[PDB]
């Protein structure tokens, strides 16, 4: 039996990438309650007329 040191025995591992994405984020569900509007300048102004 060859008495190898501790560091050499610790280097004798194989790298596996099964844990790559970590834990996935929660589902996205903001489109159900919000209205999406695109702005083109410094700010948007909205205006409506009373009855």
């Amino acid at each position: 039996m060859i008495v190898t040191p501790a560091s050499i025995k610790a280097l004798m591992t194989s790298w596996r990438k099964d844990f790559q994405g970590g834990l996935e984020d929660a589902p996205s569900q903001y489109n159900k309650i919000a209205m999406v509007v695109n702005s083109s300048t410094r700010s948007n102004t909205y205006g409506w007329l009373g009855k």
Binding site: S28, Q29, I33, M35, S39
Partner: protein, 101 residues
């Protein structure tokens, strides 16, 4: 500096619409509180005495109130005070269990 830099940037904004189309219930997720919110929202009026037509469509609850939501909206026959009764508010509302992502 012998450094690698990774950066991101976006230009977005979030704002409020009409206050008349939302109601916050600061209570327990019981049938009575849900109906109170429903009727309170249906009682809203516009300026000058006009009668708007509004009624809830969505219900948003934290992830800590999932038990009460599933035991109230997704039960065909549930308990109404120690007697088994039919559920009259099963498909009326859409449940959104938000994690506040």
């Amino acid at each position: 500096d012998n450094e690698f830099l990774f950066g991101a940037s976006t230009r977005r904004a979030a704002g409020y619409g009409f206050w008349q189309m939302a109601v916050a219930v600061k209570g327990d997720l019981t049938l009575d509180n849900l109906w109170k919110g429903w009727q309170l929202m249906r009682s809203f009026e516009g300026d000058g005495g006009k009668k708007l037509g509004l009624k809830p469509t969505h219900i948003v609850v934290p992830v800590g109130l999932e038990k009460a939501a599933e035991q109230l909206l997704n039960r065909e026959l549930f308990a109404d005070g120690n007697t088994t009764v039919s559920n009259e508010m099963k498909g009326k509302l859409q449940l959104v269990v938000a994690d506040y992502l």
